[PDB]
mmCIF file with all atom_site columns, C-alpha atoms in Angstrom:
data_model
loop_
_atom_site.group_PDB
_atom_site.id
_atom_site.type_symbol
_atom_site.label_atom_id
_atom_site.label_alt_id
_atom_site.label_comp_id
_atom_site.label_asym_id
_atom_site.label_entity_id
_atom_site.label_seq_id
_atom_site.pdbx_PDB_ins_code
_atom_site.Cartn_x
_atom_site.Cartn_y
_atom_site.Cartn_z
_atom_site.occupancy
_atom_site.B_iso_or_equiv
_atom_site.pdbx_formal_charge
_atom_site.auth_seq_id
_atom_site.auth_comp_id
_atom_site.auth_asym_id
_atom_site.auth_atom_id
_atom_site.pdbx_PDB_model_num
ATOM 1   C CA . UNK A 1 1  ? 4.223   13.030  4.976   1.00 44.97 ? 1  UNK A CA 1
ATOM 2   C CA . UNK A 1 2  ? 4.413   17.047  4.281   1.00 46.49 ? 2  UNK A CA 1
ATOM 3   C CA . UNK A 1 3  ? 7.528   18.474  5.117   1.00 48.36 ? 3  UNK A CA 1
ATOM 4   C CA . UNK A 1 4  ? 8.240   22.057  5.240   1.00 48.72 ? 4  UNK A CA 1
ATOM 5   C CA . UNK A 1 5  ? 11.189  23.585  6.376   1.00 48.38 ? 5  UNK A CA 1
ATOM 6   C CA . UNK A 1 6  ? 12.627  26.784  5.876   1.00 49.83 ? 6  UNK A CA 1
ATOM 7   C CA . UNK A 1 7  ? 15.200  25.617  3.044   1.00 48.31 ? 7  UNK A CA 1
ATOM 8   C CA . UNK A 1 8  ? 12.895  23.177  1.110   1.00 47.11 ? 8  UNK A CA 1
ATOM 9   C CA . UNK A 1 9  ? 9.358   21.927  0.797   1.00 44.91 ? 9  UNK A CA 1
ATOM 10  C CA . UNK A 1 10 ? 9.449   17.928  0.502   1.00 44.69 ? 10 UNK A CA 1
ATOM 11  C CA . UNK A 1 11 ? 6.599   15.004  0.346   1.00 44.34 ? 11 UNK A CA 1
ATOM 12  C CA . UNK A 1 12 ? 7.777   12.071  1.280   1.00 44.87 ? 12 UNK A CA 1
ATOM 13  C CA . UNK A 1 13 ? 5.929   8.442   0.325   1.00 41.69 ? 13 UNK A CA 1
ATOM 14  C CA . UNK A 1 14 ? 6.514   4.894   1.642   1.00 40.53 ? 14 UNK A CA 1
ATOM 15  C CA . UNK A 1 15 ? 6.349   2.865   -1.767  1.00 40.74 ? 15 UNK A CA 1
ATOM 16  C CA . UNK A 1 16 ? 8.195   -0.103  -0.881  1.00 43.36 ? 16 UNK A CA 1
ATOM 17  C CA . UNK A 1 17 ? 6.471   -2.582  -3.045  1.00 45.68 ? 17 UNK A CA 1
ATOM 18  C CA . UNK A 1 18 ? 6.182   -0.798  -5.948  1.00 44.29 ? 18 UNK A CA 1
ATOM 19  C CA . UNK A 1 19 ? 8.978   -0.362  -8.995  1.00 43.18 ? 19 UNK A CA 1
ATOM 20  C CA . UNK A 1 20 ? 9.744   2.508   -10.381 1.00 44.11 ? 20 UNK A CA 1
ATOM 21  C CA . UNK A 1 21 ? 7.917   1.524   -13.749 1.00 42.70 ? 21 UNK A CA 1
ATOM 22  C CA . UNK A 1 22 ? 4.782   1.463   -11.734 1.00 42.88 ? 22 UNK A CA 1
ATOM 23  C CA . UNK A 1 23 ? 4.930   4.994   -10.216 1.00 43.93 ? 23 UNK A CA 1
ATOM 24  C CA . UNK A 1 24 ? 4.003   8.264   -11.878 1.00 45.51 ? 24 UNK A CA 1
ATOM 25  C CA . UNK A 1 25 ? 4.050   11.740  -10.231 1.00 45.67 ? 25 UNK A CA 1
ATOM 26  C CA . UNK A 1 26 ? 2.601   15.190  -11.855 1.00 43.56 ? 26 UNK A CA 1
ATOM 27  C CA . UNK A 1 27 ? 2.651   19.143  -11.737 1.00 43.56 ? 27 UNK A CA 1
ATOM 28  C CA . UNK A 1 28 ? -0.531  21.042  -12.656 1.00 39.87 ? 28 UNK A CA 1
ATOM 29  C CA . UNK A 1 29 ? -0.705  24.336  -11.308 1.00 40.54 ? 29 UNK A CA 1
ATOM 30  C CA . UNK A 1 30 ? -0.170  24.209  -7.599  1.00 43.35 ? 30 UNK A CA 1
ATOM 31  C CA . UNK A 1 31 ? -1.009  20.656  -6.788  1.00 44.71 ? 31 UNK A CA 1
ATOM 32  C CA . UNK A 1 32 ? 1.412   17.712  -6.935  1.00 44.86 ? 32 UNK A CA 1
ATOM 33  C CA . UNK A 1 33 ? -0.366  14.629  -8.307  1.00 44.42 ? 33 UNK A CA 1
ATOM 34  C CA . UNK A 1 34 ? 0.956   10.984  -7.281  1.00 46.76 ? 34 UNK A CA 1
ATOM 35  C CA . UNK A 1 35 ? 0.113   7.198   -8.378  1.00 50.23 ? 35 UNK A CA 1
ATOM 36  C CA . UNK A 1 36 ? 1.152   3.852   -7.773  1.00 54.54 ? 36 UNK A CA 1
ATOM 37  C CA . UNK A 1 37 ? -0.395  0.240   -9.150  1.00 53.84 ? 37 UNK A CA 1
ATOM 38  C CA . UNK A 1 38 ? 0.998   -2.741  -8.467  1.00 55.27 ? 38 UNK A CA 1
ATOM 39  C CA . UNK A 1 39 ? -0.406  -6.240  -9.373  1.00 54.48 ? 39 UNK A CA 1
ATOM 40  C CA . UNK A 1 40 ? 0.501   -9.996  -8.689  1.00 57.41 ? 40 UNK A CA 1
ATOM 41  C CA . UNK A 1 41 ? -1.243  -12.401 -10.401 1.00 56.89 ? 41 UNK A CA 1
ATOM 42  C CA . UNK A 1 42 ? 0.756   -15.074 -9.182  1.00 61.22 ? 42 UNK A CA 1
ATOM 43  C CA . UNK A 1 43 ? -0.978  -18.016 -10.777 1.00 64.82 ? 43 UNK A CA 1
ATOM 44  C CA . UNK A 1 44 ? -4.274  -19.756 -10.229 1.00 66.48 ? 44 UNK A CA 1
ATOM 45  C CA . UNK A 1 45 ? -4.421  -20.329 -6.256  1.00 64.16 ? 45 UNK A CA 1
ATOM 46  C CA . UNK A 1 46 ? -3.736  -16.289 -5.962  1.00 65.28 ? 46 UNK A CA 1
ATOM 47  C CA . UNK A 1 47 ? -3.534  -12.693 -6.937  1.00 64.99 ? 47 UNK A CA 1
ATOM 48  C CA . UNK A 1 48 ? -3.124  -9.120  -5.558  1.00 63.44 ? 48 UNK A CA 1
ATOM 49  C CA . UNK A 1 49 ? -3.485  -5.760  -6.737  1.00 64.75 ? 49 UNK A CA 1
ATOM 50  C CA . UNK A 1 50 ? -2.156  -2.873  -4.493  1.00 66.17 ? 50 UNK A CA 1
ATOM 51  C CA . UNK A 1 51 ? -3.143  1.137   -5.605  1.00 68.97 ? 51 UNK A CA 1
ATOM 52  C CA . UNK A 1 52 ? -2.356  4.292   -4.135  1.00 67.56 ? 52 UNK A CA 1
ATOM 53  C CA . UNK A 1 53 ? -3.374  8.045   -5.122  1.00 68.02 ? 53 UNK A CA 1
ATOM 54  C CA . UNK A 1 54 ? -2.493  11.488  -3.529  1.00 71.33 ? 54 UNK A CA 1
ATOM 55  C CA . UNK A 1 55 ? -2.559  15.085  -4.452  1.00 70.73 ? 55 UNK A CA 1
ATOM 56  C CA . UNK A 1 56 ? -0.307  17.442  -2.557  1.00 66.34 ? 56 UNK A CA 1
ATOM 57  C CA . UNK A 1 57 ? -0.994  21.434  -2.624  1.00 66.72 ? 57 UNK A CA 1
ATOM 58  C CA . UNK A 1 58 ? 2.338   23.547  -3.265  1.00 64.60 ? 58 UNK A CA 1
ATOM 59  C CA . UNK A 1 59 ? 3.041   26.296  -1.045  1.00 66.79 ? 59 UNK A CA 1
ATOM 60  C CA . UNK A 1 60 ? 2.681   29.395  -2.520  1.00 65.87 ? 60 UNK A CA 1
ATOM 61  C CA . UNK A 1 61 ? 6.560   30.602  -2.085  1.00 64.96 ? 61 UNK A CA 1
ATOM 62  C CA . UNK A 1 62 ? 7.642   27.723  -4.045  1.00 64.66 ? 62 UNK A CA 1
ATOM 63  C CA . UNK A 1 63 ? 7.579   27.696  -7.667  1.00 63.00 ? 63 UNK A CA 1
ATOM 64  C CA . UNK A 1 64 ? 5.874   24.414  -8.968  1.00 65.58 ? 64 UNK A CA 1
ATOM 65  C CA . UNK A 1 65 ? 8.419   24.403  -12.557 1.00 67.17 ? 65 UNK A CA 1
ATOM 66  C CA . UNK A 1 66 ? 11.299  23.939  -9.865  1.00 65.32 ? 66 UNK A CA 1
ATOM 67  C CA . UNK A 1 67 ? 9.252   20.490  -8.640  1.00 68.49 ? 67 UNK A CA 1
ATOM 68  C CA . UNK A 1 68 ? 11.372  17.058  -8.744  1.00 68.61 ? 68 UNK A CA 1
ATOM 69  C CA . UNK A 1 69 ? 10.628  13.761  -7.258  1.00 69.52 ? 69 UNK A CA 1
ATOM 70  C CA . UNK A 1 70 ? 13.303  10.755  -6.665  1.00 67.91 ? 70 UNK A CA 1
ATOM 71  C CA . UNK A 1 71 ? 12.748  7.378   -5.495  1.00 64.28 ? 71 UNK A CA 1
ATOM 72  C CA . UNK A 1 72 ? 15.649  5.744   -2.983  1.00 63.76 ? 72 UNK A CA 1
ATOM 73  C CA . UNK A 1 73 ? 16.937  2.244   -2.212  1.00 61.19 ? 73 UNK A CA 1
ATOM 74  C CA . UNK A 1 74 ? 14.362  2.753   0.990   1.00 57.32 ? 74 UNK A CA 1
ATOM 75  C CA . UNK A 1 75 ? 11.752  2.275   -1.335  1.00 56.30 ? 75 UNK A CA 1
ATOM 76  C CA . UNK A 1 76 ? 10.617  5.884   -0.509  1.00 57.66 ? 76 UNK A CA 1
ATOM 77  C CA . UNK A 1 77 ? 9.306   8.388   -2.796  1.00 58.72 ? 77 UNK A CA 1
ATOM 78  C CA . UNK A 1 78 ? 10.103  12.478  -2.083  1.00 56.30 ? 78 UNK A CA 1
ATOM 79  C CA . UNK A 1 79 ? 8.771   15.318  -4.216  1.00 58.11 ? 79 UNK A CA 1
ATOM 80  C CA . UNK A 1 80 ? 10.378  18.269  -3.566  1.00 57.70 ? 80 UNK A CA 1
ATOM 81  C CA . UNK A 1 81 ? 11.185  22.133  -4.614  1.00 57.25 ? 81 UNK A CA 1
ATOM 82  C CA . UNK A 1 82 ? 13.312  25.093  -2.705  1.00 58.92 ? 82 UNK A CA 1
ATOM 83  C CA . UNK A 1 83 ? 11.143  27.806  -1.201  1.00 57.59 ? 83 UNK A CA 1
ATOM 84  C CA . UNK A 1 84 ? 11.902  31.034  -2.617  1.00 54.82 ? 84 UNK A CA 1
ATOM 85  C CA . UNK A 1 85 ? 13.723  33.641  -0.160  1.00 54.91 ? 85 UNK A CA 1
ATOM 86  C CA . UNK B 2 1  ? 7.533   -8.924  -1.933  1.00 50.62 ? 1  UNK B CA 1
ATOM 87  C CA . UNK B 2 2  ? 4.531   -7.722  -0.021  1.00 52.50 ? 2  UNK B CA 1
ATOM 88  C CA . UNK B 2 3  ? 3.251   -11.126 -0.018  1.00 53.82 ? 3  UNK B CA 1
ATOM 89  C CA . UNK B 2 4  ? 4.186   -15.221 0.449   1.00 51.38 ? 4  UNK B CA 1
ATOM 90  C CA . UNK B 2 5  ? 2.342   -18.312 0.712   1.00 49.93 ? 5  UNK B CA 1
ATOM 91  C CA . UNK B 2 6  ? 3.936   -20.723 3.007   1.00 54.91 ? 6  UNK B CA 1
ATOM 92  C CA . UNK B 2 7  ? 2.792   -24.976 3.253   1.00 55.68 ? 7  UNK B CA 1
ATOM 93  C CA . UNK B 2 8  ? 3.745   -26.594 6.459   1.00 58.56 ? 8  UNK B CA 1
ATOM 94  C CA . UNK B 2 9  ? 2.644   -30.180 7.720   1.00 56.35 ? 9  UNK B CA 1
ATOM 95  C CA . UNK B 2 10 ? 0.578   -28.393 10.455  1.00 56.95 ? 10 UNK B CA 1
ATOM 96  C CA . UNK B 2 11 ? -0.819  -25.577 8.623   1.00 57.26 ? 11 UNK B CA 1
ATOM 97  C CA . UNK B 2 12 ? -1.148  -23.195 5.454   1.00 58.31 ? 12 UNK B CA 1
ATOM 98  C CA . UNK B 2 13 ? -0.770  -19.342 5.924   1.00 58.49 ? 13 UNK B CA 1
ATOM 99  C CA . UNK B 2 14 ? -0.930  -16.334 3.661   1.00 58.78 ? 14 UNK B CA 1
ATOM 100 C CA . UNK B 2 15 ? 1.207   -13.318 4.866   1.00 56.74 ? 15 UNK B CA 1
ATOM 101 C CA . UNK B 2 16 ? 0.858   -9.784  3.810   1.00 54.84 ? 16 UNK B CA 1
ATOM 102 C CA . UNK B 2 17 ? 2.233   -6.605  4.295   1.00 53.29 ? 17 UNK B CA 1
ATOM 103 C CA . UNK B 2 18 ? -0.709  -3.844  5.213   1.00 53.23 ? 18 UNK B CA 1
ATOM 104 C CA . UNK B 2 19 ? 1.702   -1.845  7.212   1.00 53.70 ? 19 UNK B CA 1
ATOM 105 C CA . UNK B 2 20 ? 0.028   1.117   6.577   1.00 56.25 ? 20 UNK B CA 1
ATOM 106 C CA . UNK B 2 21 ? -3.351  0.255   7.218   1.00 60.44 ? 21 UNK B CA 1
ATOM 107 C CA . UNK B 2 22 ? -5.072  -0.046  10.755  1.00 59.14 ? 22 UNK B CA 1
ATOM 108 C CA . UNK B 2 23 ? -7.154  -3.212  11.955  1.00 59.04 ? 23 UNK B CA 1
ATOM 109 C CA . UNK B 2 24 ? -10.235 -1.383  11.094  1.00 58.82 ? 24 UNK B CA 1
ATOM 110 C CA . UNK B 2 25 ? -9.418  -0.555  7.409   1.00 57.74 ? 25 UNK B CA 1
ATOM 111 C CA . UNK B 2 26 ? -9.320  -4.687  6.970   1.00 61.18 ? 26 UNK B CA 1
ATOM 112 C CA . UNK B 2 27 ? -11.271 -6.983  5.441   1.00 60.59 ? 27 UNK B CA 1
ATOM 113 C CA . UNK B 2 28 ? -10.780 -10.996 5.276   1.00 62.45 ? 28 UNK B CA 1
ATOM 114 C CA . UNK B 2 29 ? -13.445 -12.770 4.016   1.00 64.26 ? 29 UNK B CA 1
ATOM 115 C CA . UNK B 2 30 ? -13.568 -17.288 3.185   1.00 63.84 ? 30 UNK B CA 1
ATOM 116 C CA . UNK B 2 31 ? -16.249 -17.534 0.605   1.00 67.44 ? 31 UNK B CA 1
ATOM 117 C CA . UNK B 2 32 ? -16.140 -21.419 0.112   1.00 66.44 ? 32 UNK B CA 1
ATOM 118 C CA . UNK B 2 33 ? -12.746 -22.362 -1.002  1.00 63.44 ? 33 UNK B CA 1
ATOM 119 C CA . UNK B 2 34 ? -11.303 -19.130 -1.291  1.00 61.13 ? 34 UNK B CA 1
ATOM 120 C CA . UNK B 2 35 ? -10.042 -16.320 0.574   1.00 59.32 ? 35 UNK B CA 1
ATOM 121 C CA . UNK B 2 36 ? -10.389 -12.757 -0.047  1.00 62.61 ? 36 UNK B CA 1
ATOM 122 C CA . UNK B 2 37 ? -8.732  -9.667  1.379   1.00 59.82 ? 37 UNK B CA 1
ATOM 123 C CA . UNK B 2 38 ? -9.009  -6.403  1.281   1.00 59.99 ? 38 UNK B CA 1
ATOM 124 C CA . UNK B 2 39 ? -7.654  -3.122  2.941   1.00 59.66 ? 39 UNK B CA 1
ATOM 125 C CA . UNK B 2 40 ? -8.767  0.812   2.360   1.00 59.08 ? 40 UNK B CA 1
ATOM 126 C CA . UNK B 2 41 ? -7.249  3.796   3.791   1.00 59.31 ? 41 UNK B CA 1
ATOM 127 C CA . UNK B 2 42 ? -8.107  7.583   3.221   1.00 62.13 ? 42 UNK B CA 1
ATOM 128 C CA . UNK B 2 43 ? -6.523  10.810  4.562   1.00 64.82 ? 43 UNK B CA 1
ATOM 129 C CA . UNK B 2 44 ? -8.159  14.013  3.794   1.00 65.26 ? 44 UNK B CA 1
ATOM 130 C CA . UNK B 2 45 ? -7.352  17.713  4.721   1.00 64.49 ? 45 UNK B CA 1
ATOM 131 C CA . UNK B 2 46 ? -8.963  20.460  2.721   1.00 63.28 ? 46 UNK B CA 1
ATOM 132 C CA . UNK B 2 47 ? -7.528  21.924  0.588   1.00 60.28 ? 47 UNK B CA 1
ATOM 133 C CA . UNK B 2 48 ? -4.020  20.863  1.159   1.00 61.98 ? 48 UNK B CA 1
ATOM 134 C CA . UNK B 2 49 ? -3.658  17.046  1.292   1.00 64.24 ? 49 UNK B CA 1
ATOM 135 C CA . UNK B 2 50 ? -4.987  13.603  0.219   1.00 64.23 ? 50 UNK B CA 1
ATOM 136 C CA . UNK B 2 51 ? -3.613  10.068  0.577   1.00 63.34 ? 51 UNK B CA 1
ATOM 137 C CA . UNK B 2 52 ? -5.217  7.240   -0.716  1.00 65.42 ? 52 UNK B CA 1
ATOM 138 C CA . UNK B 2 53 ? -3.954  3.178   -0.294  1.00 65.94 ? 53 UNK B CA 1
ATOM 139 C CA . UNK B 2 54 ? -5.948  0.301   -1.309  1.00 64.36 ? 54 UNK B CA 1
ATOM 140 C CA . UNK B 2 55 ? -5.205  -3.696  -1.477  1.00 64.44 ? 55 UNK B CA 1
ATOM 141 C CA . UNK B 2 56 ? -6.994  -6.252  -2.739  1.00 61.09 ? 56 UNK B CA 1
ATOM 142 C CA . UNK B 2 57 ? -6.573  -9.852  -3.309  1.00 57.75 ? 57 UNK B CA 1
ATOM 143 C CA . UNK B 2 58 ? -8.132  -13.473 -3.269  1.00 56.38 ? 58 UNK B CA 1
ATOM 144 C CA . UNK B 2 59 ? -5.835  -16.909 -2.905  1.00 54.70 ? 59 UNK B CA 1
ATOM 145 C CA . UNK B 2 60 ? -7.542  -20.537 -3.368  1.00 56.40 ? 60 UNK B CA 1
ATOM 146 C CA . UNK B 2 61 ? -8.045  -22.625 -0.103  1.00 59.76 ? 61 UNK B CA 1
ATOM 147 C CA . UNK B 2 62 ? -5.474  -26.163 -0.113  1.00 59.48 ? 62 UNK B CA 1
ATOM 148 C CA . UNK B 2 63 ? -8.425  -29.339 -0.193  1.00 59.18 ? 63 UNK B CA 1
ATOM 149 C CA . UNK B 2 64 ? -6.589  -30.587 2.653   1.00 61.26 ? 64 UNK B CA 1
ATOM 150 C CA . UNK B 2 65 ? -8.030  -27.449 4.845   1.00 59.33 ? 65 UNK B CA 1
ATOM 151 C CA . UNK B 2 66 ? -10.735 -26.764 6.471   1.00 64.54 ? 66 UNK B CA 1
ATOM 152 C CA . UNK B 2 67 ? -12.390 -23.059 5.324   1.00 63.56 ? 67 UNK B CA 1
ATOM 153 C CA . UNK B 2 68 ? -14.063 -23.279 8.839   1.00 63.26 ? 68 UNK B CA 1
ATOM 154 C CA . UNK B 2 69 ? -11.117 -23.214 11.199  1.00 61.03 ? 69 UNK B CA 1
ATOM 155 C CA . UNK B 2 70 ? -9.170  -20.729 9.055   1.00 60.53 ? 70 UNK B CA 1
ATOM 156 C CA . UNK B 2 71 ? -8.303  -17.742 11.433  1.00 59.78 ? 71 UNK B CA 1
ATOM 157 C CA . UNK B 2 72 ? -6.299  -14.165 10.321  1.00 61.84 ? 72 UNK B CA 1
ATOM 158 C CA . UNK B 2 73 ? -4.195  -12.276 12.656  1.00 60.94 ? 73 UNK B CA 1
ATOM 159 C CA . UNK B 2 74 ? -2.281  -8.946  12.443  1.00 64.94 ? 74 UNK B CA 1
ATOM 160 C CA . UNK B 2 75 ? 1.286   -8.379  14.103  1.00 68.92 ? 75 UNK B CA 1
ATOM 161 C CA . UNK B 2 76 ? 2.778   -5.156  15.314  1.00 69.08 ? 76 UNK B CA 1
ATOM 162 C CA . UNK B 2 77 ? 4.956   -4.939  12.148  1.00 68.94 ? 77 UNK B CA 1
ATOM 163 C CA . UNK B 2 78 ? 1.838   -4.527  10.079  1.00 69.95 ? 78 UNK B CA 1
ATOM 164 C CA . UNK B 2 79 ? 1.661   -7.825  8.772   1.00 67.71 ? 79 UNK B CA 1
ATOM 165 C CA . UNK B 2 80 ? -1.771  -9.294  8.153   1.00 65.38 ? 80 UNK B CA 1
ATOM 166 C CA . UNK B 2 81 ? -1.155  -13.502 8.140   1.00 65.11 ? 81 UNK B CA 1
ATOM 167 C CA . UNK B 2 82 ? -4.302  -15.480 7.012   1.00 63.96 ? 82 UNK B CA 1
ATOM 168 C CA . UNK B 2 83 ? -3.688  -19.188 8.392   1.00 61.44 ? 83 UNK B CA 1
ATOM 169 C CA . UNK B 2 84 ? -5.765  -22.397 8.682   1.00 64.55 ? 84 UNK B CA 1
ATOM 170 C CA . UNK B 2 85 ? -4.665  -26.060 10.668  1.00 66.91 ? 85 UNK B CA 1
ATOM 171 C CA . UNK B 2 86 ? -4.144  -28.651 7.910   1.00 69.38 ? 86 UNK B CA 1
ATOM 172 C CA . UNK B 2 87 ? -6.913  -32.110 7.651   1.00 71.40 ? 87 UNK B CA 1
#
């Protein structure tokens, strides 16, 4: 979920079932790169294995080394930078 | 958790959270004894966004129930619950 207003430029994720030791997030150039895995081998009746991937495109008045993401007690994950002006 | 296992007299049911997903990304599948899941959802617009959520998972089948009669439903809260009538 993209969200631009005229302060800031945020991404917000719903990661509710992952921890934070399972989530990465990345800069390169203009394009903000997520991941989650999460996996539940839970014995020998059962397992599960949840993934997600997504690449986000900066806008070109913000500068991608001013990027930072943050996780909340929501379980949601935001990546967001102030747009130059 | 995004998932339980619950064993009542009645019945045996697998429940799942696939909130994200609509019915028509999901898969449930009894291959003999065991079930198998899975969910896959893609959002794409060029050249500014992609989203990408997969699930996938397989639980073993109680002796007491029959694979035949097992049924899956999903809920309005985006929960996906596998359950079967126990023998």
């Amino acid at each position: 979920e993209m969200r631009l207003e005229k302060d800031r430029f945020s991404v917000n994720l719903d990661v509710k079932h992952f921890s934070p030791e399972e989530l990465k997030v990345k800069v390169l150039g203009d394009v903000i790169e997520v991941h989650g895995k999460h996996e539940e081998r839970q014995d020998e009746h059962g397992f599960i294995s949840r993934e997600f991937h997504g690449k986000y495109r900066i806008p070109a008045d913000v500068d991608p080394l001013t990027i930072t993401s943050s996780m909340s007690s929501d379980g949601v994950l935001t990546v967001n930078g102030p747009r130059k002006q």
